[PDB]
Write an enzyme that holds these catalytic residues in place. Sequence first.
Site, short mmCIF file in Angstrom:
data_model
loop_
_atom_site.label_atom_id
_atom_site.label_comp_id
_atom_site.label_asym_id
_atom_site.label_seq_id
_atom_site.Cartn_x
_atom_site.Cartn_y
_atom_site.Cartn_z
N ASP A 70 -0.59 -7.48 1.58
CA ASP A 70 -0.02 -6.13 1.66
C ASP A 70 1.46 -6.18 1.99
O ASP A 70 1.91 -5.85 3.09
CB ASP A 70 -0.84 -5.28 2.63
CG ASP A 70 -0.41 -3.84 2.71
OD1 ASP A 70 0.30 -3.38 1.78
OD2 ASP A 70 -0.83 -3.14 3.66
N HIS A 101 0.78 -1.26 0.00
CA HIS A 101 0.00 0.00 0.00
C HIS A 101 0.82 1.31 0.00
O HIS A 101 0.27 2.36 -0.32
CB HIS A 101 -1.08 0.00 1.10
CG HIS A 101 -0.59 0.41 2.45
ND1 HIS A 101 -0.31 -0.52 3.43
CD2 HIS A 101 -0.34 1.65 2.94
CE1 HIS A 101 0.10 0.17 4.47
NE2 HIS A 101 0.09 1.48 4.23
N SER A 124 3.90 2.10 8.40
CA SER A 124 3.54 1.05 7.44
C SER A 124 4.74 0.44 6.81
O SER A 124 5.71 1.15 6.55
CB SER A 124 2.61 1.59 6.37
OG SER A 124 1.30 1.70 6.92
#
Length: 235
Positions: free
Chosen positions: A89, A41, A185
């Site tokens: 992801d 992402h 992330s």
Amino acid sequence: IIGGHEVTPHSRPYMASVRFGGQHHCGGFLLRARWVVSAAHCFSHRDLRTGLVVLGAHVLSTAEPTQQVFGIDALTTHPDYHPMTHANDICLLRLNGSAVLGPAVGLLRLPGRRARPPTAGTRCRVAGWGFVSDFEELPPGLMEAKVRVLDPDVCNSSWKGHLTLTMLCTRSGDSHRRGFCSADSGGPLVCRNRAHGLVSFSGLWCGDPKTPDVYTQVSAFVAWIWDVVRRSSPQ
Ligand SMILES: *[C@@H]1O[C@H](CO[C@@H]2O[C@@H](C)[C@@H](O)[C@@H](O)[C@@H]2O)[C@@H](O)[C@H](O)[C@H]1NC(C)=O
Ligand SMILES: *[C@@H]1O[C@H](CO)[C@@H](O)[C@H](O)[C@H]1NC(C)=O
């Protein structure tokens, strides 16, 4: 990182900062000298040429002598990555050179190819240069929070049944909110010195127990990671 503390400079030498337009955007980790694992992402609708990978960092804003900055030769996103669900992801970044390993730059080991995820209660640590609060406040340097693995079914219930089998969650060991936040992330979840999880997504409020911290279950992707690295070995 929410409910964490600043690490001793360069004590997590595998930590990588993925920059876009000069600013830190996501985390990641050094797998091999020319390979960084990050979250899929983090690279959606982004010109790879605007991206830089920083190793050996503490204070991102300082041109630290330990820092090694690289360009991305190739982004390999998981073929089954689903932005709507955060399924698969994970991505690989092939650097435009090999990191010179030393005290400030090192590798983080993956779990076993067929390893089980860690069980609920397993003590893990998560690091990043992401927000330290719900007030868009940046940390002084690389930060780390102590977290415990949460039951995936209890986590799935809090996420109203939207989690996939290759996802794991965490909770704080105490009453204080501990976990990741925006720009953490792609950073790893380290349980017993292996990269078991990878920061994927959370709720509106960082570390909020009602919307537990969701990670990509790394052990389910080790065979895929090695097949990408190996197939990109001759170049
Ligand atoms: C996660 O949970 C799913 C079931 O969730 C329940 O059903 C939906 C329709 C909603 O009512 C929700 O609030 C409920 O919690 C399972 O279908 C799914 O397989 C589960 N995933 C995993 C990985 O176990
Ligand atoms: C790697 O890429 C960056 C950005 O494109 C560039 O500044 C750097 O000089 C490149 N390094 C090598 C060894 O080609």
